[PDB]
Design an enzyme around this catalytic site. Structure first.
Site, PDB file in Angstrom:
ATOM      1  CB  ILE A  88      -0.970   0.025   1.200  1.00 30.18           C
ATOM      2  CG1 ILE A  88      -1.379  -1.384   1.649  1.00 30.18           C
ATOM      3  CG2 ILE A  88      -2.210   0.847   0.866  1.00 30.18           C
ATOM      4  CD1 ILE A  88      -2.025  -2.240   0.567  1.00 30.18           C
ATOM      5  CG  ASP A 133       5.933  14.463  11.901  1.00 25.90           C
ATOM      6  OD1 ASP A 133       6.786  13.788  11.288  1.00 25.90           O
ATOM      7  OD2 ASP A 133       6.245  15.301  12.768  1.00 25.90           O
TER       8      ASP A 133
END
EC number: 2.7.11.1
Lengths: 4, 329
Positions: free
Chosen positions: B21, B180
């Site tokens: 993925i 983040d």
């Protein structure tokens, strides 16, 4: 992401 | 034990069922079904003298804080004082010795033929290496490919509410700074529950769901404190992060650097607030909604979100933002  | 071959960790049934993925500097992301449930597999190169994808290999004591913070954030979803299910659970971690099996190599080739990757071919690696394996629970599709799939403004309001609540509980419990939140780091999962339960310092509340659940991942650059000790990573000597341009996400790093006078060891909860600001920026500019804005009530909530966006920066912390701003009452 964190670093271009 | 220790560095066992990947055969024991990944039997043949799971190897043939691996779909690949995501990618990054850290390593590889794989998806498979185990124990009658889809689980996420992250595999990273560890303790090598070689150079791959523009950076040398990482070393074990530097990856230990990663697993420490992952297992600590996983466990808080069962604590009675402060609880939320906005994180991803830890299943297992191990060490793998060997090389790369051909099946997932062909899977990566399939991905590259479809959409592509920015990394090198992981076929040069020998038997003597070590690897690290991460088992995470499936989150769904991240926000980056869901831009043209959201329902309306109410879904956006619920998304911001869930993110703010989760970060609020995180700060109130473990004094957390993750730092983040780029829009490729939030996960959406379809659900049938109409409301969510979150408790902070012994007081319960409920949030409308609109049929979605939100989770946060990729804690490689986070900070945490527990029992007087502080766990983090010092990034004060590598400046390529602060040289970015072309996006507000590039600017916010230098902004928080200005805020914290280049001291990564301090607890500045304001750092998360700029990340919420950035996320709100994307939700108003880089999104397209299926439904128009004709209903007067949805115009009202649009004005509420606009005021929230333009007046958030005067506020101190995520918990105070949760219990003070006009949006959530």
């Amino acid at each position: 992401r964190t670093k271009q | 034990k220790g560095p066992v071959p990947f055969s024991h960790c990944l039997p043949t049934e799971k190897l043939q069922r691996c779909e690949k993925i995501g990618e990054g500097v850290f390593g590889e992301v794989f998806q498979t079904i185990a124990d009658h449930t889809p689980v996420a597999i992250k595999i990273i190169a560890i303790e090598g003298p070689d150079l791959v994808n523009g950076s040398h290999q990482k070393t074990f004591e530097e990856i230990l804080p990663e697993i420490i913070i992952s297992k600590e954030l996983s466990l808080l979803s069962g604590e009675v004082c402060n609880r939320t299910e906005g994180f991803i659970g830890l299943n297992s971690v191990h060490c793998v010795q060997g090389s790369y099996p051909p099946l997932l190599l062909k899977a990566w080739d399939h991905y590259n033929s479809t959409k592509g990757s920015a990394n090198d071919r992981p076929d040069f690696f020998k038997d003597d290496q070590l690897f690290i394996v991460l088992e995470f629970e499936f989150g769904g599709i991240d926000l980056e490919q869901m831009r043209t799939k959201l329902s309306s403004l109410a879904t956006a309001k619920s998304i911001l509410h869930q993110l703010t609540a989760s970060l609020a509980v995180a700060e109130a419990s473990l004094r957390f700074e993750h730092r983040d939140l780029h829009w490729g780091n939030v996960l959406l999962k379809k659900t049938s529950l109409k409301k969510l339960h979150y408790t902070l310092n012994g007081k319960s509340s409920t949030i409308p769901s609109c049929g979605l659940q939100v989770s946060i991942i990729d804690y490689t650059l986070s900070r945490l404190e527990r029992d007087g000790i502080v766990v983090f990573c010092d990034v004060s000597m590598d400046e390529d992060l602060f040289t970015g341009d072309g996006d507000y996400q590039f600017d916010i790093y230098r902004l928080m650097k200005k805020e914290n006078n280049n001291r990564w060891g301090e607890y500045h909860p304001y750092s998360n607030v700029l990340w919420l600001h950035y996320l709100t920026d994307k939700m108003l500019k880089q999104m397209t909604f299926k439904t128009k804005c004709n209903t007067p009530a949805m115009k009202q909530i649009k004005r509420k979100i606009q005021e929230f966006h333009r007046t958030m920066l005067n506020f101190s912390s995520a918990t105070d933002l949760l219990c003070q701003h006009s949006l959530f009452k």
